[PDB]
């Protein structure tokens, strides 16, 4: 379908060269997309749309929804139980939030853990070309998003806001990131199974 070709194009076209030279996510310019599955979880969808309507009413009738990537070793728990801020802690650049990227390759750096962890479970390789990885392409309600350049360890959204947008700066994020502090503000719409490809 064209819906899945659209997802594959967003996955491929948003790849960037990383500052760490591929340390966290592996060395690649493109992916081998194996499968794209649409997640249909009615209870999670309703939790998401209920919150989306509330945020829209608090943001000049505008949800400020975006399709963003999310990488995690816990993709299976997310598709069944949803995103959960109780699993977030203060240690990230913007604190105890749930993080998303507009660049698929940035989300790919988190699939095997923080900084890629020890890589794939079978080969302990962050640049594994063999093992199949999974990323989520998500509907995310940003609402009134607080723009920030430097570290600001939050527990919750800033007063009057619904999310934080980390913008690139000198010393300094290389790429944007989007952070929510309520799990119901994202819906894991597509589950993408893929491999990174050797350049
Ligand atoms: O796709 C993403 N997944 C999570 C991390 C992430 C980014 O932020 C790194 C911030 C460190 C704190 N995180 C929360 C708890 C454990 C994982 C790391 C930025 C953009 C996308 C993502
Ligand atoms: Zn492997």
Numbering used by the authors: 962 to 1160
The authors write:
Here, the high-resolution crystal structures of the human TNKS2 PARP domain in complex with 16 various PARP inhibitors are reported, including the compounds BSI-201, AZD-2281 and ABT-888, which are currently in Phase 2 or 3 clinical trials. Tankyrase enzymes are now appreciated to poly(ADP-ribosyl)ate (PARsylate) a number of target proteins which contain a common RXXPXG ARC-binding consensus sequence. While both TNKS1 and TNKS2 knockout mice are viable with a decreased body-weight phenotype, TNKS1/TNKS2 compound homozygote knockout mice are embryonically lethal by day 9.5, supporting genetic redundancy between the two proteins. Both TNKS and TNKS2 bind to and suppress Axin2, a negative regulator of β-catenin, suggesting that they may represent novel druggable targets for cancers dependent on active β-catenin.
From our 1.8 Å resolution structure of the TNKS2–DPQ complex, we find that the DPQ molecule binds poorly to the protein, with only one of the four active sites (chain C) represented in the asymmetric unit displaying electron density sufficient to build in a DPQ model.
